[PDB]
């Protein structure tokens, strides 16, 4: 404290029939009950999620804000309202009514509610386009999926985005989102558990290998979920492939552990014996505090795994506000 | 001071024309050069992956044995010759002669060259049989994929198969194939680096979630390759997801972290930091040595990471050889 929380989601409240407008069983709209403590999120005229009274209302979000130690939070789209599958404009027509929606929700107070854009990705220009339009108009950012829908990131049109953006001093969020196992994982949340993690590290991965990295400025500031799913765990295990196999060497001219100085993770890794090594692998510089707020699978307590932690204070000052206070340009 | 290796695979020599009889098209088989030092695993009349002399010979195995300082080898069939996919009774026949193969591998050098067993994992019936068989032949167990298409670990036909082999005092090494992940990984082994140690902590979180561990004997002796993929590092998100998710909760009814005195994983994580994570979840008790010899990706110098480890004499001596002796019962 301050202490920034940079990862948390917002739903918008747009009526069926404006949703309809757009696609009519496709776009999502938000229904709320007589006791509007809930409510849930719809596709067509039927149940999609039941959801949480926080995901939309910034009123209700502040009082939860004082009750968390939480001064600012930075809030972007669910990846439901990605939309990276529709007809390319009407996704950039949908993309900037989100934005705006966005920022209404952050008119209620724009000191602690900071929000990120979405970008119809499925077209470059409009994509490109949008995401200045937005962060002009007031939003710190991007967040994106993280593939679309079956050629990762290392796509050289995905890269021409992330150049864009970087050229422009556009912070990212990159979010999993649309795994990924197919038929499989139905119970328990697996995909959550097992996929999301495991997409998020293919991004990561992808960026790496494909040597994305050697052509993208350093001025790319980009951060993954989740503590960057699974990455950090199983680096060794890259760096051991990309030192036995020419194959995994060819587009990736230094040790793949080398790239961690070029992209910032969250770190919400929910354990001490992870956020310790998630910290030894990225440095304190650039591993930011994010909660996935309000989902059931963030942190309910948000900062308490940092705050707990055996972690220096020099350390836990950069997590909790530091780096998110230039990732975003926030002070 | 003795060394085991508890995880190195192997490829018997078929010839073409005898795995003909079988498929025509899906057979694997084994070319050899001239020479007898390079070699080709075929399938039908196309080359699948280029292989070394060590796959195939094993005195020529002993002798890299002997250069790396391992005194015992266990060792089982190379994925691509489970067959799963197959008619069950030839797929069984399959199974029969490839564990015939093995202990005329093991036959070389029976002290310090020990087998795994397949089995026909599509059928429950003939899967016992072949699995009850194979040990009373001399094979210490069994390896199996992690799942056969849609069936994950939870599905009632590989948990009654895991509960046979508890009955029967077999052990079984879980190994992760047929990745998940499509048209998605094609570059620079991607889905060993991401799909492969995903698979492997599905399989795991699949029978804890389940709660197939409280209908499984506590008896049952099973190991998960590659340092259970990524399990140990997002056992966290897990434990959090199962507290605040009843539909986590719903068929497992004690948080996921206490299920690791109920399985073991092999020490293959190519990385200090991460090993030392793995042990504090698993224990000194539950992790042992296995390399993935003699594939490009595995541990090149085996035992090396352990060894140059931080962990007291007597941890190490559990991972080199104390564990598996006791886990494959090996004198
Ligand atoms: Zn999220
Ligand atoms: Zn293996």
């Given at each position: 404290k301050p202490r920034i929380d940079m990862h948390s989601h917002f739903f918008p409240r747009i009526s069926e029939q404006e949703a309809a407008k757009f696609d009519a069983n496709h776009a999502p709209w938000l229904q709320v009950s007589a006791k509007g403590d809930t409510g849930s999120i719809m596709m067509g005229?039927?149940?999609?999620a039941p959801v949480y009274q926080a995901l939309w209302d910034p009123a209700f979000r502040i009082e939860e804000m004082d009750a968390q130690g939480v001064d600012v939070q930075v809030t972007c789209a669910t990846p439901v309202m990605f939309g990276y599958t529709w007809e390319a404009n009407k996704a950039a027509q949908w993309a900037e009514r989100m934005n705006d929606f966005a920022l209404e929700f952050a008119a209620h107070n724009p000191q602690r509610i900071k929000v990120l854009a979405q970008v119809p990705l499925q077209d470059l220009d409009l994509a490109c386009k949008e995401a200045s339009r937005a962060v002009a108009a007031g939003h710190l950012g991007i967040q994106i999926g993280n593939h679309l829908g079956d050629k990762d990131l290392d796509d050289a049109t995905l890269e021409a985005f992330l150049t864009h953006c970087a050229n422009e001093d556009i912070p990212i969020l990159v979010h999993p989102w649309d795994m990924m196992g197919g038929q499989r994982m139905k119970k328990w949340m697996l995909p959550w558990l097992v996929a999301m993690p495991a997409e998020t590290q293919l991004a990561i991965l992808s960026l790496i290998l494909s040597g994305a990295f050697e052509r993208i400025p350093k001025s790319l500031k980009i951060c993954f979920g989740?503590?960057?799913?699974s990455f950090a765990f199983l680096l060794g295990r890259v760096d051991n492939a990309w030192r036995h196999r020419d194959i995994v060497r060819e587009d990736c001219?230094?040790?793949?552990?080398?790239?961690?100085?070029?992209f910032f993770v969250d770190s919400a890794v929910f354990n001490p014996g992870a956020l310790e090594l998630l910290v030894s692998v990225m440095?304190?510089?650039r591993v930011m505090l994010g909660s996935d707020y309000p989902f059931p699978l963030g942190e309910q307590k948000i900062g308490g795994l940092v705050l707990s932690s055996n972690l220096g204070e020099s350390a836990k000052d950069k997590i909790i506000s530091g780096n998110a206070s230039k990732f975003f340009n926030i002070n």
């Amino acid at each position: 404290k301050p202490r920034i929380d940079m990862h948390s989601h917002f739903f918008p409240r747009i009526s069926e029939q404006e949703a309809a407008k757009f696609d009519a069983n496709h776009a999502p709209w938000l229904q709320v009950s007589a006791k509007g403590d809930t409510g849930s999120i719809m596709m067509g005229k039927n149940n999609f999620a039941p959801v949480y009274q926080a995901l939309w209302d910034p009123a209700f979000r502040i009082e939860e804000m004082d009750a968390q130690g939480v001064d600012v939070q930075v809030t972007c789209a669910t990846p439901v309202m990605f939309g990276y599958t529709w007809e390319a404009n009407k996704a950039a027509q949908w993309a900037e009514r989100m934005n705006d929606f966005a920022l209404e929700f952050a008119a209620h107070n724009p000191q602690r509610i900071k929000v990120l854009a979405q970008v119809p990705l499925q077209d470059l220009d409009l994509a490109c386009k949008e995401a200045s339009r937005a962060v002009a108009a007031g939003h710190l950012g991007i967040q994106i999926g993280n593939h679309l829908g079956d050629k990762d990131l290392d796509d050289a049109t995905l890269e021409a985005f992330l150049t864009h953006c970087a050229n422009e001093d556009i912070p990212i969020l990159v979010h999993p989102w649309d795994m990924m196992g197919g038929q499989r994982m139905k119970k328990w949340m697996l995909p959550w558990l097992v996929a999301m993690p495991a997409e998020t590290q293919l991004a990561i991965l992808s960026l790496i290998l494909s040597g994305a990295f050697e052509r993208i400025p350093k001025s790319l500031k980009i951060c993954f979920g989740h503590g960057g799913g699974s990455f950090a765990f199983l680096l060794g295990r890259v760096d051991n492939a990309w030192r036995h196999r020419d194959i995994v060497r060819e587009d990736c001219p230094r040790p793949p552990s080398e790239y961690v100085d070029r992209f910032f993770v969250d770190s919400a890794v929910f354990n001490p014996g992870a956020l310790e090594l998630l910290v030894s692998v990225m440095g304190e510089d650039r591993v930011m505090l994010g909660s996935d707020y309000p989902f059931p699978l963030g942190e309910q307590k948000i900062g308490g795994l940092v705050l707990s932690s055996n972690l220096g204070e020099s350390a836990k000052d950069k997590i909790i506000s530091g780096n998110a206070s230039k990732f975003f340009n926030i002070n």
